[PDB]
Amino acid sequence: MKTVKHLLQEKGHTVVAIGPDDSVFNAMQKMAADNIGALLVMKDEKLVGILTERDFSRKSYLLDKPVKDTQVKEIMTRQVAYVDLNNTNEDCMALITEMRVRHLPVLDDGKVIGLLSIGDLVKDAIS
Amino acid sequence: MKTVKHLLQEKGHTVVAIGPDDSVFNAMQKMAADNIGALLVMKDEKLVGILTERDFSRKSYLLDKPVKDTQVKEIMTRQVAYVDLNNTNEDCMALITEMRVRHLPVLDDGKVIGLLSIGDLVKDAIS
Ligand SMILES: NC(=O)c1ccc[n+]([C@@H]2O[C@H](COP(=O)([O-])OP(=O)(O)OC[C@H]3O[C@@H](n4cnc5c(N)ncnc54)[C@H](O)[C@@H]3O)[C@@H](O)[C@H]2O)c1
Ligand SMILES: NC(=O)c1ccc[n+]([C@@H]2O[C@H](COP(=O)([O-])OP(=O)(O)OC[C@H]3O[C@@H](n4cnc5c(N)ncnc54)[C@H](O)[C@@H]3O)[C@@H](O)[C@H]2O)c1
Ligand SMILES: [Br-]
Ligand SMILES: [Br-]
Ligand SMILES: [Br-]
Ligand SMILES: [Br-]
Ligand SMILES: [Br-]
Ligand SMILES: [Br-]
Ligand SMILES: [Br-]
Ligand SMILES: [Br-]
Ligand SMILES: [Br-]
Ligand SMILES: [Br-]
Ligand SMILES: [Br-]
Ligand SMILES: [Br-]
Ligand SMILES: [Br-]
Ligand SMILES: [Br-]
Ligand SMILES: [Br-]
Ligand SMILES: [Br-]
Ligand SMILES: [Br-]
Ligand SMILES: [Br-]
Ligand SMILES: [Br-]
Ligand SMILES: [Br-]
Ligand SMILES: [Br-]
C-alpha cells in the first residue's frame, strides 16, 4: 500500500495547466509538446476544470467552429474528481477504474500539487 | 501471472472495427456511441491500423481539411503493437508502459479475436 504523497514523489510534482479562456488549439498543442493527455484548467488560482483527450475526442468536432475559435471552457470537464496526499494507490485504482477517468489531480489544502494518471499506477505496479 | 486468454475471457471477445476509407467523423461518432477509445482498422482479415483518441487529439486539427473530409487511414496508427495467446498480463503491462499505447489488439493464429486496454489490465489487478 502506497500513499498518493509517495506516488507523486516517484512521478514528480509537475502541474501542466491552461486557462479556461485560451484556445483549444493552444491546449492540444501543449498536450502534444509535453506528451500528456490532460491539462488542469486554472482561473484566478481556482481549479475550474480539467481538459482531457477524451473531452477533445468526444466534444470538439461536434462544435460548428474550428479549434482556434473554441475556448477551453467550452469542452473541459467541470466536475473534477481528485485525490489528496493521504489517499492510496488502492483508492486511485478504484477511482480510475470505477469512475472511468484516466487522470486524478492531487489537491493539498486548496492547492493543486500534482497529477496522477492511469499510466503512473501501471508503471508503479510493474516497477 | 495470467494469460492473455484468461484476460480476454474476463473482457469478452467483442471487436469494434472501422474501415480505412470511412470518415473520421463516423469513426469518432462510433467511439462515442460505444464508449471506447480505439477502433481496429481492418481490410478483410488484415489489421491495417488502429484509430485512437490519441491519434485524433494529436493529428486531426493539424490537417489541411475538416474532419468530415478526412478518412480514417489519414490519421490512424499504422504500426500496431499487438499481443496473442502466447502472451501474459506482464507482457501487456510492460508493452503498454514502454510503447505508450493504451490498446492492444489480441490475435490468434493471425486473426483479431479481441482487444485489451490499459483499463482492462488495471481492472484485473484490483479484482
Ligand atoms: N513509460 C512511462 O514512464 C509511462 C509513464 C506514464 C504513462 N505511460 C504510458 O503512456 C500512455 C499514456 O499515459 P496515460 O494514459 O497515463 O495518460 P497521460 O499521457 O496523460 O500521462 C502521461 C504522464 O503525464 C502525466 N500528466 C498527464 N497530464 C498531466 C498534467 N496536466 N500535469 C502534470 N502531469 C501530467 C501523467 O501523470 C503521466 O506521468 C499509456 O500507454 C501509459 O501506459 C508510460
Ligand atoms: N470499470 C471497468 O469495467 C473498466 C474497464 C476498462 C476500462 N475502464 C476505465 O475506463 C477508462 C477508459 O478505458 P481505457 O483507457 O482502458 O480505454 P478505452 O476507453 O478504449 O477502453 C474501455 C473498454 O473498451 C474496450 N475497447 C476499447 N476499444 C475497443 C475496440 N475497438 N474493440 C473492442 N473493445 C474495445 C477496452 O478493452 C476496455 O474494456 C479508464 O479510466 C479505465 O480505467 C473501466
Ligand atoms: Br518534480
Ligand atoms: Br503550465
Ligand atoms: Br484564461
Ligand atoms: Br471558467
Ligand atoms: Br483522457
Ligand atoms: Br489560437
Ligand atoms: Br463535467
Ligand atoms: Br479520461
Ligand atoms: Br491464467
Ligand atoms: Br464493428
Ligand atoms: Br473501407
Ligand atoms: Br489502408
Ligand atoms: Br474473419
Ligand atoms: Br492478414
Ligand atoms: Br488512446
Ligand atoms: Br495511440
Ligand atoms: Br485532400
Ligand atoms: Br497525420
Ligand atoms: Br504509425
Ligand atoms: Br518504463
Ligand atoms: Br496465438
d(CA B105, CA A115): 29
SS (H, E, C) A3-50: EHHHHHHHHCCCCCEECCCCEHHHHHHHHHHHCCCEEEEEECCEEEEE
Resolution to one decimal, Å = 1.6
C-beta atoms surrounding B7 within 10 Å:
22
Range of the domain at A56: 1-127
The verdict on B97 touching A (C-beta cutoff 8 Å) is yes
A56 phi/psi in degrees, rounded to 5 = -60, -50
**What is the CATH classification number for the domain harbouring B23?**
3.10.580.10
Number of domains in chain B: 1
The verdict on A82 touching B (C-beta cutoff 8 Å) is no
Residue bearing the CA closest to ligand 1, atom 27: A36
- When computed from its CA atoms, the radius of gyration of chain A, rounded to whole angstroms, is 15
Q: What is the separation of C-alpha B108 from the centre of its chain, rounded to a whole number of angstroms?
A: 16
Work out the angle between the directed axes of helices B118-125 and A118-126 (0-180°, nearest 10): 60
Solved using: X-ray
d(CA B30, CA A32): 24
d(CA A16, CA A39): 6
